[PDB]
Amino acid sequence: RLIEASLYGGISSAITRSLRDYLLPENSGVRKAFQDMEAALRENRITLE
Amino acid sequence: SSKSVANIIRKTIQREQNRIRMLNQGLQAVSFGQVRGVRLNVNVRESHAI
Amino acid sequence: VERDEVAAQKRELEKQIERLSQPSGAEDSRMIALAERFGGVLLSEIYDD
């Protein structure tokens, strides 16, 4: 998308729609703590099912 | 719990805002016809701010 | 006996994984609160990048 938008020129519609998806990096720190803390419950629930 | 999570979220938000602000300065005073500058405007949604 | 020995290895592996989790993997049990209770920042977090 980046390359071809540059090739034809103009304000790309697709880039404009998903602006946050392109310009912001995804951060794992906020998440993995809670995945590990959540683990004991997840396993228990799956076992019960 | 609680406050510490809020602090890490706030610091991440602050760092992203600052980096964007740095990128933003490189684009000042670019002349394209009648356009004279470009910016990436970053804001925080209310429903999440509260 | 084989079951229990493998269980011991699995417990060690989870404990090792868990130490590397969050927020910037460290002795997270108390260190996060200790980091904010003074006007300071965790060194390992400064060297995250």
UniProtKB/TrEMBL annotation, chain B:
Compartments, record wording: Cytoplasm, Nucleoid
Signal sequence range: none
Record-annotated membrane-spanning stretches: none
Domain of life: Bacteria
Family: Belongs to the SMC family. MukB subfamily.
Purpose: Plays a central role in chromosome condensation, segregation and cell cycle progression. Functions as a homodimer, which is essential for chromosome partition. Involved in negative DNA supercoiling in vivo, and by this means organize and compact chromosomes. May achieve or facilitate chromosome segregation by condensation DNA from both sides of a centrally located replisome during cell division.
Entry remark concerning the domains of this protein: The hinge domain, which separates the large intramolecular coiled coil regions, allows the homodimerization, forming a V-shaped homodimer.
Subunit comment: Homodimerization via its hinge domain. Binds to DNA via its C-terminal region. Interacts, and probably forms a ternary complex, with MukE and MukF via its C-terminal region. The complex formation is stimulated by calcium or magnesium. Interacts with tubulin-related protein FtsZ.
Name this protein carries in UniProt: Chromosome partition protein MukB
Gene from which the chain derives: mukB
Full-protein positions shown: 1236 to 1285 of 1482
UniProtKB/TrEMBL annotation, chain C:
Gene designation: mukB
Functional summary from the UniProt entry: Plays a central role in chromosome condensation, segregation and cell cycle progression. Functions as a homodimer, which is essential for chromosome partition. Involved in negative DNA supercoiling in vivo, and by this means organize and compact chromosomes. May achieve or facilitate chromosome segregation by condensation DNA from both sides of a centrally located replisome during cell division.
Subcellular location: Cytoplasm, Nucleoid
Protein's recorded name: Chromosome partition protein MukB
Location of this fragment in the whole protein: 644 to 692 of 1482
This protein's domain notes: The hinge domain, which separates the large intramolecular coiled coil regions, allows the homodimerization, forming a V-shaped homodimer.
Family statement drawn from the similarity comment of this UniProt entry: Belongs to the SMC family. MukB subfamily.
Assembly and binders: Homodimerization via its hinge domain. Binds to DNA via its C-terminal region. Interacts, and probably forms a ternary complex, with MukE and MukF via its C-terminal region. The complex formation is stimulated by calcium or magnesium. Interacts with tubulin-related protein FtsZ.
